[PDB]
Amino acid sequence: MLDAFSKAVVSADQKTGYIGGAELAALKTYIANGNKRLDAVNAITSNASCIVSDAVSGMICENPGLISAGGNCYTNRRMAACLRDGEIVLRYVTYALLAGDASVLEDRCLNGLKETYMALGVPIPSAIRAVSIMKASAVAFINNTASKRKIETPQGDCAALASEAGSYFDMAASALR
């Protein structure tokens, strides 16, 4: 996998170039925002169980056919598998947010997932909705706007981090379309 720094290294290498002043400055800013990034990750991990269960339950309450006879969340075995998948995706999203790069998520989670779901009969529109709810959830916790649970951090702005996190959930959705 790559992180924000090794990603810049891959670009420099494509040009047989050294990384110096110009390119180094954006990375120093990334470092300066490091404490916030750590808080953003802690905001998701600290609420992982809640994010997943709320998203799968929301997917279901908006489409009750999923828990009807022959729905793909019907039986405890399928419901448990779906909750597990929700957690897997969230876990890889937190990896991406800690690394500052999507490669761990794309390579180890999203690659092949659409094909897996098509072969199993897992309904993709419903999965995309579960992912969307987790996105709303995770972003609210990063921004400290969650309705029922707050997180105390030093006062400031995490909009870029919330957008970056959102983008990783959007890549999950895009990989299934």
């Binding site: 720094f5 810049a8 290498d13 991990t45 992982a48 690394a99």
Partner: protein, 164 residues
């Protein structure tokens, strides 16, 4: 590519875990050490031409036998490939300093090197002389601060040990 974060993420992934306290704390260390190694990266990026020329010149001053028929520096074009190789390695050292780990060197410089150098009659001692000279020529505070120097020298020693 091995760095502070990819190592803790690979361990978390193997155990099916979310990032936890020791993982975040590891990344904090990366934040602390960054100023020293990025100083070193920046100096190397600005100064690589003269560093590479000195290192190559030193190889052939130490081992003039390389210029004799049947050896690795026996044409102008092979002598240039040697300086090129030194440039490649210094670039990989710049990348290690930016990433804060050995990944760039491991993957793009060291893996397969012994096999290639054996096949092409490229003595490893020539490369070692280049890096040893480079390591010992550098000084603080003139070229960089003392902790930047420690970082720079650590990756040179790392490649020296991989070749010896």
């Amino acid at each position: 590519m091995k760095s502070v974060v990819t190592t803790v993420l690979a361990a978390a992934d193997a155990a099916g875990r979310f990032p936890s306290g020791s993982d975040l704390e590891s990344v904090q260390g990366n934040i602390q050490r960054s100023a020293a190694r990025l100083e070193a990266a920046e100096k190397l990026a600005a100064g690589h031409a003269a560093v590479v020329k000195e290192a190559g010149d030193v190889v052939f001053k130490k081992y003039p036998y390389l210029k004799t028929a049947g050896e690795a520096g026996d044409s102008a074009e092979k002598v240039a490939k040697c300086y090129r190789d030194i440039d490649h390695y210094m670039r990989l050292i710049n990348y290690c300093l930016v990433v804060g780990g050995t990944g760039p060197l491991d993957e793009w410089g060291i893996s397969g090197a012994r096999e290639v150098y054996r096949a092409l009659n490229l003595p490893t001692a020539a490369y070692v002389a280049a890096f040893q000279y480079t390591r010992d020529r550098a000084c603080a505070p003139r070229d960089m601060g003392p902790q930047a120097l420690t970082e720079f020298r650590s990756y040179l020693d790392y490649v020296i040990n991989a070749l010896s």
